[PDB]
Subunit: 331 residues, 4 copies
């Protein structure tokens, strides 16, 4: 059974989701909505500064996008209620504009004829959030879900392994994060995030994030036990989680590594990765894992206090798991 | 003292504001953007490119207080509603990047201002000026343009060469710093596809009418110059790369001597002359609009030469905007 | 019939040459020399910030490099004379240290048992230089050759088309060039190139280059008709030639484009490329062409005075042509 | 009363120490040693990508540097033993080559006629290290001292306030650090630090650092209670400490801020600073403080577990405190 999917917001996540969908037989992107002509949309798909040339055929024929022989409806509707998803029989919508992160806005896709919606960001409201490999089995057939944030998808699988094996008393996270689309090339206006308005190439830019706290929803036993912040730094992609955590039961650094390696080859296979090499961020570019543990980078103070490092391609990992979630909620 | 309002407190708007603090003939009395006063104070106080504001800044009752002087802060999206007359504004610096024509910029005059300086090249037949090159052609027009940063770098250089040796024809490249219109990662730029690609990752080609506009600034060079741009990942300071054919032969030393002479005479404070192993950040903060790099350029022969001139695209332009304000009110 | 190659200098060119050689049947790398342990060389091959992970297996067995199961001798000899190339029966050495750009230094590989040497930079002496597609047929069986510079391999094919079709009166070139290994992260010492010592990430940095003048040697009819300079800018790879040229016979921009396009499909196929799209530098990353003409980027003042833009991956294009030159000089 | 100082190693620290010395009456730089001609040294002093044009007058007269009316001897001795510091009556040598971080090597300055030496890095041996404002009063008249690291100088004043007021149970530190001269523009050789060889502009690059552990020597009561690591990111200057710490006595975030503010106005005035604004890294560029507490950036999980953020200009702050140490050890 092939799932028919529409994308709203053909941005970094929308376009990276699109490419990943191409390598799957169970998902077909049959419609795309943004504020772009079909020919510009084709160009943005074909050429990518971060992930290179698109491996496939793209043509524009009569205002529709034709990719690898398939016609894809292209629209320019600012209001999702007008998207008429039913006319192309769309099952699930990828909501990746970054503008519609609540039930009252995202449900407009269902009003427009879609059956289900995956929001590609943290919920503004009580829309349930999921992290593949951590709490996806708690899905109950809801029509609208959230795939949480890229950072939460990095921290939660790491947090799960530790909490399961040793238990987490409490933790503080820093994510050192690549530049994103919300940032500015030179000091410019960001009325709700003053620091985020400062030139991205020139600065280390601190930021607030609810991603560590959000892990409390993904892993309920950790509710109120984790929080943190971020530094935005001048790279185009790939980010890293820096988790300082207190453990319930003692664990040597080797034992933590053995536990992470085991989960990476067992239950968290294809989600959590294990690396024991001298890597740097660009070595992670293109990796579809959502959490890549860096064994050599981290350090133990003692058997109950440890700093752990995990990489994530914030575009690619998240995007592949958006597709995993689509397959899961439709199974 | 000329009372000035700024529309668009962006890179140019704010660098103009700082430069004005160091002028005795100009006072900024109103600023319009889409910002609260406290955010506006913050953007002024801290600058990634030019450092901490060299003055006192505070907010008192929804007004900006800078060096003890009160400045009206508004958030009118439509310039027609700016009520410049209520703070007795003479001239408006139009630096939003949105109003580059007579019909749009004239809304400031509808709103009570007397004159308007547009801080970009005109979209229509609004006259453009480059200080030191054609500013004496100003005829009392109420609305003028200060052209572009690139034109302000190229025109003084072209003038010196054209006056002394004459220019047959020339092609220009500007290697340009990143600007606010660009994107941090590949994003939407429907009218400029290349410019939408991530700025930090790329050398990004661009069209520019900046060399061709020198034809309007120096009429004898009409149809004799054109060029393009490469946008590269630096935050500020740009450089002009002019390949030019000369009418009368000149050695490289002779070209340099003419430029040096002009920089000490008629073009003092506009065109500069440097004879050192400099790089772009050495030009950051320089108020000149054209800084000739003697050592960087090269002659093929006595009639064919490549000349290099730096410009702080924020600071030089911004200072000459203020020079143009003083000139058109003189 | 397969040419056995040794690499001296496993730097950017050595390693990109190595990767290009993996996809060729007529050339195999059997030895590498640098100042590195075998396991560090393996790491440098495996992970590449610019060109991503090595597409294959890399391992160390007994002080040797094992790539896709094939053993490669690893040595650490500072003096090329001690390399014992005869012991692994190397035919041709890729001299890519950047230190040995003369007959006197490079011939030490021949003393050490190699038959021929390709120097991967411009000659300091009268060692003959070549650009594939332009003057490679002038090769006369010399034991030591140079593949000229990356910039010269971009300019010469473009200059050749213009010169052949319309004739070049005079020309001035600018290359806007990516950062390279000789540059500095922050202002540091560069006694023979002061500008080049200034922080690379912070600056546009003017530079001298003999690349346009050297095209006068590659294309003798253009001797004394070309020169230029460079600006080094903060990108990691891919550079662009900016050629301002006066033509003998009149040509419209379309006629110039048609000529370049025809050559790219004919005589200069696989050397000179033709692009008619809104590309930026990163789109050229990984392209094995030595010159990629950007039709939309350039501009004519008139039918005899024109500015032409041509891209080049300064690592990949040059490296592939080093291998093309090796194949040619042994044929 | 005026201390006569020679600088060995006119690099980033040497040149920034030099400028800071111009604005002090109690310190005179009377000699500089590097591997540079006098005119190149003049140029390196005059133009600085990070801190702008030098404000004073600089000239070369007969192989000597003349700055603001004072003559400065320029030498090119690779071996410090030959520096003849006595011929220009040098009291203290600033040892900032980065090569001589032990008693055996730094003592060559004393052989060469100097009375005392300040090493501008952490000691490799048992050479005593100091952080101004924290343990400088433990100085006992030693001829050779170390000013520790830039990172230690940021952490120790912050850790001192917390330990004094609330007590530190344990802590783990991350420093997000600007690029330095030891790094590479593109993937290059770094045999003793593989990650550090990777292209700095392209990467977030993890690194080990003993700076947190070293605070155990600066503050003995904290021995074994702190350690940490680093991420090197592509900015030219200014770094930030990210300290996750468990407190003995409970404290609100407000209480932590008030305690740090009080110290910044009292005992640690001019050493530790307090900022309550939406700043980013470039706002700290040029600040001579060694630790600038960012009240708004940090976050508490609870009253005993907190993450604290403190900035530092790694060139300027450290360089100023080098001079403060010179003033102190000669009083
Ligand atoms: N980039 C990451 O690493 C990352 C990771 C995880 C989650 N996210 C989240 O995904 C969402 C999008 O992120 P992004 O990086 O792709 O941003 P983006 O700016 O690159 O993409 C947003 C796209 O939506 C388009 N758009 C804007 N308004 C629209 C409208 N009314 N209707 C239809 N399309 C519209 C825009 O043209 C743009 O192309 C955000 O919520 C983000 O927080 C991003
Ligand atoms: N940055 C340069 O180097 C440079 C040099 C010369 C000329 N210019 C030109 O100056 C103009 C502004 O350029 P910039 O770099 O300062 O861009 P910018 O984006 O930094 O500044 C634009 C400012 O205008 C504000 N604004 C947007 N809409 C507004 C509205 N309706 N009303 C009032 N304010 C509004 C924006 O919030 C922003 O602060 C452009 O036309 C530009 O081409 C720029
Ligand atoms: N990078 C480019 O874009 C490019 C293009 C064309 C030509 N070239 C030229 O090729 C040559 C190499 O350039 P690069 O960018 O690869 O520099 P690089 O620094 O990246 O590589 C040089 C390598 O040689 C090693 N080496 C140094 N001394 C050695 C010795 N005595 N014996 C053996 N190995 C030694 C070094 O450890 C290093 O790994 C230069 O001449 C360069 O100008 C470079
Ligand atoms: N840069 C920082 O942020 C920082 C902060 C604190 C401490 N430090 C430390 O200070 C020391 C220098 O740091 P840096 O950033 O200034 O490095 P740097 O590379 O900028 O300076 C080193 C200087 O020493 C010169 N030199 C090399 N060998 C020499 C020799 N035999 N004799 C005389 N001079 C020689 C070099 O030419 C160079 O100019 C290092 O130990 C560093 O860890 C650096
Ligand atoms: Mg599919
Ligand atoms: Mg092969
Ligand atoms: Mg002094």
């Amino acid at each position: 059974m092939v799932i028919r999917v529409g994308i709203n917001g053909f941005g970094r996540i929308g376009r990276v989701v699109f490419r990943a969908a191409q390598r799957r037989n169970d998902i077909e992107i049959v419609g795309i909505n943004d504020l772009l002509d079909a020919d510009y949309m084709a160009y943005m798909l074909k050429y990518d500064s971060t992930h290179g040339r698109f491996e496939g055929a793209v043509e524009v024929q009569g205002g529709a996008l034709v990719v690898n022989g398939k016609k894809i409806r292209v629209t320019s509707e600012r209001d999702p209620a007008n998207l008429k998803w039913n006319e192309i029989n769309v099952d699930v919508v990828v909501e990746s504009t970054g503008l519609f992160l609540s039930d009252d806005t995202a449900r407009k896709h269902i009003q427009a004829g879609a059956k289900k919606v995956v929001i590609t960001g943290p919920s503004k409201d009580d829309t349930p959030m999921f992290v593949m490999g951590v709490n996806h089995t708690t899905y109950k057939g809801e029509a609208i879900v959230s795939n949480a944030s890229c950072t939460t998808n990095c921290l939660a699988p790491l947090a799960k392994v530790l909490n399961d094996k040793f238990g987490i008393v409490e933790g503080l996270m820093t994510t050192v994060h690549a530049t994103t689309a919300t940032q500015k090339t030179v000091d410019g206006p960001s009325q709700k995030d003053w620091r985020g308005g400062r030139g991205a190439a020139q600065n280390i830019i601190p930021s607030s994030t609810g991603a560590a706290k959000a892990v409390g929803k993904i892993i309920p036993s950790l509710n109120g036990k984790l929080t943190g912040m971020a530094f935005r730094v001048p790279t185009p992609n790939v980010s890293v989680v820096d988790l300082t955590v207190r453990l319930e039961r003692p664990a040597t650094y080797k034992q933590i590594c053995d536990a992470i390696k085991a989960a990476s080859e067992g239950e968290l296979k294809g989600i959590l990765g294990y690396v024991d090499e001298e890597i740097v961020s660009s070595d992670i570019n293109g990796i579809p894992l959502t959490s890549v543990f860096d064994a050599r980078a981290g350090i133990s103070l003692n058997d109950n206090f440890v700093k752990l490092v995990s990489w994530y391609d914030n575009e690619t990992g998240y995007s592949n798991k958006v597709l995993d979630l689509i397959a899961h909620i439709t199974k």
